[PDB]
Design a protein around this ligand. Structure first.
Ligand code: XNW
Ligand code: XNW
Ligand code: XNW
Ligand code: XNW
Ligand code: XNW
Ligand code: XNW
Ligand code: XNW
Ligand code: XNW
Ligand code: XNW
Ligand code: XNW
Ligand code: XNW
Ligand code: XNW
Lengths: 141, 141, 141, 141, 141, 141, 141, 141, 141, 141, 141, 141
């Protein structure tokens, strides 16, 4: 029923800045699309963004305690944070990793994720629709 | 309009063998689900499977000449074939890479793809629905 | 006399979550055991936990200024944070690194620590008692 | 006209602690020297320091929106933070990376920077004057 | 009840030679401290040292057959011996690895252990007290 | 008082060739700017360029014997010459390494320097002004 | 009862070409020896060779469906084919890997096998008799 | 007298597709140029292309049995196929490796060839003329 | 005629300990099977086991002087001992390396052998029968 | 019209020394063959050899200023010199790299070239004729 | 005055076996040459050989206690033994490492020594005379 | 009879500069000691030093043509020059590599030599006497 979408550092700058790498859709507009898609699927989406690791960890903690699924785009922390991975390892419901850009076509450091190995699955490079497709997966599981 | 789904080696054994790694859905059943989903989206899906690299290359050649999108699960060739990548580099329409299992949770050799860097995007670990979600992406682009 | 025990990200979830990896002892219960052991040793233990790197750095700063020893379980930051190491390099009194789990029996990324090279010593895999044994070391030095 | 000098973790401990590695000049004294040098150059320097990544990201966000140059000494985050790099990639005006110590004469992990590749240039090992020389570069460009 | 302390090559030279790296406590004096601490804990400590791998293997064999715990400082063999590890893999009671010096602050070859991954836990850099703290762990488990 | 500026292979082609990578300022013009800046600082700059390693070594030898500081842009030899480093290790006065281009944004082989570890500091990517800023450092030390 | 011997690329050239690396026994002669040895053991050997990966995969598919053991010398595909490994992972009866030459005394690329980790065991360097000894193993298991 | 030119996967798409990487000369046109050049040299050129490894191996087998020279552009198989190399190791007459593009200016995986070490020599980056120049070498040897 | 079977460290614990990794056949029982198989083959088998490298070297020395073949399972020394390899390099008669377990399915350090490159061939993972099959090879050569 | 052939260190010893690695053709004889071939092609070849890097750089400088093509066999400097590469990067006309021996069949250090990535193409292992074939390429382009 | 020459595993087989790699001089003959050379130099040479690490360690222990120089050819243990290095680190008088063969022209594993970094110096490839030249060094120091 | 001693870059600064790393013996004094030792041995020593690679190559060329032995301390070029190695490969008489300092106790880049693999043998760390001991080797061979 309830799906948590969690965005990490820099994702609040979406759409306003570089449309070429990530599209012209803003973060508020992303929230609205996610919410609408969720309703259409019979789900409720709770969308949160922070530049602060501590805050992201708290939000993951709450999803772990509530047994709720998580769609996570951790931004740069995807490649760097062991703490984020430790928090995600506690989740009993599915974890879907989402990236807007195709990280496998970019710098080598973007091609390693601490989250991919413990995630149910991973969607990258499909832009904003990535989030919407992850919702649909959760709806049919 | 027309979307080519191309499956590589061993994907014909789907469902019949190990349900634990890849699910109990067979290849014919996968074809039927794909076709039905495509119709619902206003698309036509042409689904092909081969254990032969030469055959896969021919099918990619035809999609390149027809300017048609490709959803590709190359099986083991994903990690090994430069020729498959060279053929895919000719595609002008989108290439979506799909894997049923989460390759990033398996042996290290499965975590490298010759296709990921030239693909539009990549879906892994979402099972058979991976293909269906790739169709939906193509429908809205 | 005064010993600072500093716990990093996720250590507040102790005991409540996965008992199999880290034991069924909670963080409050860990604090109580540490305090009791310290008194028995003639020491005072000040136990602090945060998911926030900035907060951990402040607590290390204060131990550096007060010339006090530190027992540090930095959680995931153990493997990732150069800033935490820079702060610890200022400590003139002993630094004992403690991990509950045996990090050397886990993923390769857990087998590298930015803290181990500048620590007096390191205890891992002895569970919660690790902290208590570190206290006893400090008491006899 | 306006130049933002941004200091990351541990840089508030300057001068007060180890003079041997980083000099006896304190952070407040660094601010005063920077301000004075800026005035002499016809610039205004806004100098900010934080141990918190989130705060550093916000300050980089504002420089990106205001089209202002940045002189950045990210401390330990220089070697570890992809998020900091993503924020800096948005800057349209020059980014000068500055380190007080010669990081290339220290541990191997200090010889890799996520920031160097996207910076205009890099000054290291010239102590506090590093900042002043970066100001002069910006003044003549 | 019975705890076997096994020391490998060069550990008989303790105290007599370099006090700076390993302390001024000799091997006989180490035996006496261990014995006294064990009695205080309600245990019996059997302390053995050899420069001969074959001898160390025999002593590990006997602990395996008697179902007794082992505290092991294998000296240089820690980093080099697969045979020692194979023998230790047979132990059903706890194995605690102990090193006097902080091996993680020394040459890179000292930072890899064939024993760490199969040990219950590892204490390094706490000097001779390392052995005593390992005894206390065994006493409370 | 006297500062030696030493340029290695290819630096005589400056300005005349590719302005895009290194600027439109020629080597003679660089000499004139350096000389003028030095006078303004109360210094004398002696600027030398050679494509010959032997010649560069002789010039470093003389600075070593005269106890004079060196500003060195060794060109390609920066990444390749152990002999140049051995000669520079004899210098008792400061060595400042300067590169016009940001070597850390270029091919991986340009990101390693045999000189950086023994230099006082390093300026890269600030163009021709790099030399001038190195002079100013020497003037205030 | 039935044992499938499967030979990959180039193995049809046996004996006719270089006797020095692989012996003077031809492929037809190998078939005859295998058949005779099998009869003596109370088994039936079905020996197949192809230069085509697709064909080898089909033959492995059939052994998987029939629950029959496989003795496999995949030739060059031993070191290169993930698809061959995926097909072999389905086998429920034993897989014995056989190579005529000692691959561990040859080029480094011959010392890695995608098949070795999932095989029951591996015989190399014992020439043609390798196949015969693998038969004998299967006969007594 | 007779020279075999063998082209691997994707080389049938020549000229028709991307002229920018490989030129606007088609495969049939390449055959005609090769034939004409061969006649002028007093040779006969037999030019074959396949996307199928098995087919390429058969053609190499025949050149081995006939003691005839081979000019080989294996396409993607150049970087991936041990089987192709094993077949080429049997050739007693010269093997010239040819690539149209300069593989050393492209992705790192194109800079390794299983064929280069056993080839007489290698021509890359000289386009279609590469084949013609290889013919001329064979004519004068 | 005479075949020396030499077993290294820990192989005396066979059968008595972990049957799951190595089988329930003991070392004395292994000796008896080897002897019986040898007689049936017209050979004499001399079977020796030691945990001492020096002893193994002496036994290899004697086989070198007597020009006798060796079947060697060096245990952990397989992966670690250059001295054992130097002794084996003197053998003029065949050396067959045997391991009970499939070392290629275990830890990465077990997948490197100092002996494999100088051995005639290698049998692994076929259990105790490995030794018997090595005898049969020697009998027919 | 004018083609510069530039030979680096040791190439003056050609033919006189080891004929087995490089052929019995001397450097003067190489010059004569090159000149004759050039005339036949309607070109003028200017052939220069030096053991001195500085001299080679000067000759490359002149070809850069005159907009003339270069055929370059840099000898050992091929694998070691960044300065030589920097000089060659200025050439606007084609650069053909030539080596007499097949460097890809020799020591691993000969398989890396600083020149290959910026060269038009590369000919190796075709002996002295390599130079002649490079001339013919330039003639038809 | 007294110089200890210590030989490790396999060195007792000298001269008797392979003269091609190590010369036809036997170990007893080596002892005699060493003794004679020592007398001529005014020294006493005590020459010891063992295949047993424990024995070598004891002999190093005695040289450490007696403050006597050591000439050490540890055989295979040169590349493998940390324990041997730990024992040698205690020596206050010079340690000269000697190898008969040129280890740098042999397998890569022979090109790493645990002893070289703590030795005064190293002589390799000069055969038996290596020992004699090491004596002469000790005589003049 | 005639022995050529060749010294590379920086060796002319001997003794005059840092006595701590290389001793207080100057280059002229080294020449005199070498000459005197040679006479005593019945040899003639010709000692040459240059900072110029070209010059060193010429001197090696002459020793190759005259069939004379070489004692070579190439300085920094030891670790960097392929050209120097190519020249030395032509020598038919012995090549002894000599270094004053123990390069194996210094930076990792000093532990690789392009010359060691083709040299007869190598002496390092025995100071100036290294040269004298190399002479004595040549005298008795
Ligand atoms: C400024 O607009 C942004 C858009 C997306 C992101 C997220 C991406 C990111 O932070 C990278 O570190 C990461 O490698 C990929 C990313 O998470 C994405 O493409 O979704 C960040 C900033
Ligand atoms: C027997 O059922 C199969 C199911 C999926 C696959 C495809 C997978 C594969 O071949 C692996 O080589 C690859 O790493 C992942 C894979 O492509 C997938 O999970 O989709 C193969 C056989
Ligand atoms: C949810 O309970 C937890 C218990 C311990 C920890 C700390 C551990 C940790 O965060 C890992 O990143 C680290 O590799 C080891 C750890 O610090 C420990 O085992 O003490 C985290 C969460
Ligand atoms: C306690 O005084 C300090 C002074 C400088 C720094 C900054 C340096 C730092 O944090 C290291 O992680 C980094 O490698 C270099 C550093 O940024 C600098 O030398 O400027 C930190 C603490
Ligand atoms: C001479 O006094 C000694 C003291 C301790 C040791 C043991 C140490 C050792 O042998 C090293 O090989 C190892 O890396 C660490 C060691 O086991 C320890 O510090 O306990 C050896 C000799
Ligand atoms: C043709 O104009 C030139 C300008 C600068 C340089 C110097 C640069 C160089 O030689 C590179 O090898 C090096 O990596 C960086 C360099 O030293 C610089 O950017 O200052 C060379 C040629
Ligand atoms: C031409 O005669 C041949 C004989 C054996 C083989 C098989 C071998 C092979 O293809 C190599 O790629 C592989 O490394 C070893 C091999 O499978 C064997 O030695 O059995 C191939 C050709
Ligand atoms: C679609 O036109 C093509 C042209 C050349 C090739 C051959 C090239 C190839 O397949 C790459 O895998 C290889 O790295 C280089 C290649 O063989 C060549 O440039 O000749 C393939 C397709
Ligand atoms: C306790 O029973 C044992 C059985 C076999 C072995 C031998 C194995 C061994 O020692 C490992 O170091 C090696 O990697 C493989 C081994 O030699 C074998 O499986 O035969 C050791 C102990
Ligand atoms: C003594 O006769 C020589 C012949 C060729 C060369 C050139 C070769 C060379 O210097 C090697 O460093 C390089 O790897 C290959 C080389 O450039 C060639 O084979 O053309 C040198 C000396
Ligand atoms: C059988 O005659 C022997 C001669 C010398 C050696 C010593 C050599 C050795 O053991 C190798 O492991 C080592 O790499 C070099 C060695 O120590 C030497 O060449 O002196 C061993 C056996
Ligand atoms: C300034 O006095 C010197 C003395 C010796 C050397 C030679 C050494 C050298 O150049 C280093 O590059 C090399 O690693 C070792 C060296 O050749 C030696 O120690 O003999 C150089 C300068």
């Amino acid at each position: 029923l309830i799906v948590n979408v969690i965005n990490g550092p820099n994702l609040g700058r979406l759409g306003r800045r570089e449309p070429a790498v990530y599209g012209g859709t803003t973060h508020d507009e992303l929230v609205a699309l996610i919410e609408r898609e969720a309703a259409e699927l019979g789900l409720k989406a709770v969308v949160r963004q922070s530049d602060s690791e501590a805050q992201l960890l708290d939000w993951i903690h709450q999803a772990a305690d509530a047994a709720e699924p998580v769609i996570l785009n951790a931004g740069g922390l995807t490649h760097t944070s062991v703490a984020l991975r430790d928090a995600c390892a506690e989740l009993s419901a599915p974890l879907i990793e989402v990236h807007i850009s195709n990280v496998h076509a970019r710098e080598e450091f973007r091609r390693h994720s601490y989250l991919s190995p413990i995630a149910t699955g991973v969607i990258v490079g499909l832009g904003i629709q990535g989030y919407l497709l992850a919702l649909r997966y959760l709806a049919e599981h």
